[PDB]
Amino acid sequence: ALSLTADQMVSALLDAEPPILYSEFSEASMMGLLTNLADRELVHMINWAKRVPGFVDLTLHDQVHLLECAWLEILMIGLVWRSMEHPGKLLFAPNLLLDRNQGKCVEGMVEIFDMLLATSSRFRMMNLQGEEFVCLKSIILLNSGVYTDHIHRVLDKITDTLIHLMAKAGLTLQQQHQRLAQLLLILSHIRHMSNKGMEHLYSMKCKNVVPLSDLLLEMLDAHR
């Protein structure tokens, strides 16, 4: 996993990409669609994580911890990435493209939508490439739970991978580490959206809007 070239790292991450799933407006209905979609994507996320270089080298315990902490961040950065070519809208699924006013159907969701829409517009403003996205999503998986040595050197490898992409795109030395910073600082906002999104799902649980799957509850209980 550390003997991988920069180009070989990009290809490994690209091949590991999970499929874009489809969906099946009131509060219970839309929440039903989202929870169903999230439960099905989670199954692909787990298999995607196993295809991430260096992730299988981790113990089962550590693999669980990283996924439990980052699962919503990963869902969001995926959503945000798919929503890039759809300004003012969020693409949860190809048959489920929602705008911010459709977020008012569920109480306390429109605030999360506005943050998500902001991240997608920020992605488009930076003209984020697919080769960069797969790196960021892999960084999220390995970083988010690392503080709660092998992991940090895989992170360094992805950093080397990110710079290699930028150096390939004709970016000068100054432009390279400047863009690297701008990308990683967005991860701070993605973490923020997750925490606000995680609290919202817990409130939906307490309100019993829609019965969540046992898996989705276990991922949700891992944050308490």
């Binding site: 199954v43 787990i46 298999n47 196993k50 089962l60 693999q63 669980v64 996924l67 439990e68 046992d214 898996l215 276990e218 991922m219």
Partner: peptide, 8 residues
């Protein structure tokens, strides 16, 4: 945990 079985 269900997450255990899916990782295996």
């Amino acid at each position: 945990k269900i997450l255990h079985r899916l990782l295996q």
